[PDB]
Design an enzyme around this catalytic site. Structure first.
Site, PDB file in Angstrom:
ATOM      1  CE1 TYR A 118      -3.776   9.788  -0.134  1.00 40.17           C
ATOM      2  CE2 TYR A 118      -3.589  11.277   1.796  1.00 40.17           C
ATOM      3  CZ  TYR A 118      -3.696   9.980   1.257  1.00 40.17           C
ATOM      4  OH  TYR A 118      -3.784   8.907   2.164  1.00 40.17           O
TER       5      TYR A 118
ATOM      6  CG  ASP B  94      -9.176  10.888   5.634  1.00 37.23           C
ATOM      7  OD1 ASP B  94      -7.939  10.933   5.554  1.00 37.23           O
ATOM      8  OD2 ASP B  94      -9.782   9.930   5.125  1.00 37.23           O
TER       9      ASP B  94
ATOM     10  CD  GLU C 141      -5.321   5.911   1.166  1.00 40.98           C
ATOM     11  OE1 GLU C 141      -5.596   4.853   1.773  1.00 40.98           O
ATOM     12  OE2 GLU C 141      -4.199   6.359   1.131  1.00 40.98           O
TER      13      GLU C 141
ATOM     14  CG  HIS D 283      -1.845   1.264   1.359  1.00 43.29           C
ATOM     15  ND1 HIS D 283      -3.191   1.295   1.034  1.00 43.29           N
ATOM     16  CD2 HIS D 283      -1.497   2.562   1.717  1.00 43.29           C
ATOM     17  CE1 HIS D 283      -3.660   2.572   1.209  1.00 43.29           C
ATOM     18  NE2 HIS D 283      -2.617   3.331   1.646  1.00 43.29           N
ATOM     19  CD  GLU D 284       1.570   3.339   3.951  1.00 47.40           C
ATOM     20  OE1 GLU D 284       1.287   4.305   3.168  1.00 47.40           O
ATOM     21  OE2 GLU D 284       0.937   3.129   5.009  1.00 47.40           O
TER      22      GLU D 284
ATOM     23  CG  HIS E  95      -7.406   7.202   4.687  1.00 43.12           C
ATOM     24  ND1 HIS E  95      -6.994   8.440   4.936  1.00 43.12           N
ATOM     25  CD2 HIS E  95      -6.268   6.445   4.419  1.00 43.12           C
ATOM     26  CE1 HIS E  95      -5.638   8.502   4.857  1.00 43.12           C
ATOM     27  NE2 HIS E  95      -5.201   7.276   4.510  1.00 43.12           N
TER      28      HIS E  95
ATOM     29  CG  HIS F 108       0.306   6.160  -1.091  1.00 45.46           C
ATOM     30  ND1 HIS F 108      -0.797   6.685  -1.673  1.00 45.46           N
ATOM     31  CD2 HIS F 108      -0.137   5.656   0.158  1.00 45.46           C
ATOM     32  CE1 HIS F 108      -1.864   6.486  -0.879  1.00 45.46           C
ATOM     33  NE2 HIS F 108      -1.447   5.974   0.253  1.00 45.46           N
TER      34      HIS F 108
HETATM   35 ZN    ZN Z   1      -2.602   5.325   1.806  1.00 51.43          ZN
END
Ligand code: ZN
Ligand code: CA
Ligand code: CA
Ligand code: CA
Length: 304
Positions: A150, A214, A159, A135-136, A219, A139
């Site tokens: 974002y 957020d 995301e 996941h990271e 998310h 990005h």
């Molecule tokens: Zn993320």
């Protein structure tokens, strides 16, 4: 050199390290410009110090898993997509573990992956789930391809692509973050892709979050896109629409091309529907079962 050691879940694995003087560094020079893993020593300076060990049998579960899963993610992108690291040109993959004290998150910062330890209650060390590592790192892939902003729908897409890829790397289930969340409860997760509302994400566009928290719900609203991907891969009938599943292999090729070749920094969910239909057409033909499934998966989650 070949180091060995246990991951956050207690599983012994091997990975590549570098002998340097009297010890080994957690550094693999054989993948692109390197996979290199650091400790922040429970402070917040990054990258911190390269992790070291005297005999190459490692006792740092978080760093073992940060390093191993970054190498595996490197192998996954090259094997599956022909991509060489985050930039396609072998960018060095830097990870830092033991970031902060009892710190309940992990993140990509434009340069490297950084992982908290978690508080031991809600979370354990975040590199312990290969889908969180996936996941990271994804990005960074997005930064170098569509460069999705974002905020709002763009940020939800950002995301969702990170969850689609992280989840696809491990292929254990339809969950995200399940290996490191709530170690005292089996079978829950940070997010579910098959049933997003289980964890308070919407699964249909008619329940889009439209508040400002957020970054406008990035998310939260990813749940809608994760649901579309799940319907394309697995199939189902949802909101009256039947999607014939085309399997993860084809779905993840379609989403990879869509999100790296067709989307751009301002894309919203409608653009994503168009991009996913286009990639399915590129890969299977304009009137193929795959192109039809791509369109239905978006009809199903109410994105027109
Ligand atoms: Zn993320
Ligand atoms: Ca040792
Ligand atoms: Ca997982
Ligand atoms: Ca749990």
């Amino acid at each position: 050199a070949t180091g060995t050691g246990k991951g956050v879940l207690g599983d012994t694995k091997s990975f590549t390290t570098t002998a340097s003087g009297s010890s080994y560094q957690l550094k693999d020079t054989t993948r692109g410009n390197g996979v290199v893993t650091y400790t922040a020593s429970n402070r917040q300076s990054i990258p911190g110090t390269i992790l070291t060990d005297a005999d190459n049998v490692w006792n740092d579960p978080a760093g073992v898993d940060a390093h191993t899963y970054a190498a595996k993610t490197y192998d996954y992108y090259k094997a599956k997509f022909g991509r060489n690291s985050i930039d396609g040109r072998g960018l060095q993959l830097r990870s830092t573990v033991h970031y902060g004290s009892r710190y309940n998150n992990a993140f990509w910062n434009g340069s490297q992956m950084t992982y908290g330890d978690g508080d031991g209650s809600t979370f354990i060390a975040f590199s312990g789930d290969p889908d969180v590592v996936g996941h990271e790192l994804t990005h960074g892939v997005t930064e170098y391809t569509s460069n999705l902003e974002y905020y709002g729908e763009s940020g939800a897409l950002n995301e969702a692509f990170s969850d689609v890829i992280g989840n696809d790397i491990q292929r254990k289930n339809w969950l995200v973050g399940d290996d490191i969340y709530t170690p005292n409860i089996a079978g829950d997760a940070l997010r579910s892709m098959s049933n997003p509302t289980l964890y308070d994400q919407p699964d249909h566009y008619s329940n889009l979050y439209t508040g400002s928290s957020d970054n406008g719900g990035v998310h939260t609203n990813s749940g809608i896109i994760n649901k579309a991907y799940y319907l394309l891969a697995q199939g189902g009938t949802f909101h009256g629409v039947t999607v014939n599943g085309i399997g993860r292999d084809a779905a993840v090729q379609i989403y990879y091309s869509a999100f790296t070749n067709y989307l751009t920094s301002s894309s919203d969910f409608s653009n994503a529907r168009a991009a996913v239909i286009q990639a399915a057409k590129d890969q299977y033909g304009a009137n193929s079962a795959e192109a039809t499934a791509a369109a239905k998966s978006f009809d199903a989650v109410g994105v027109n």
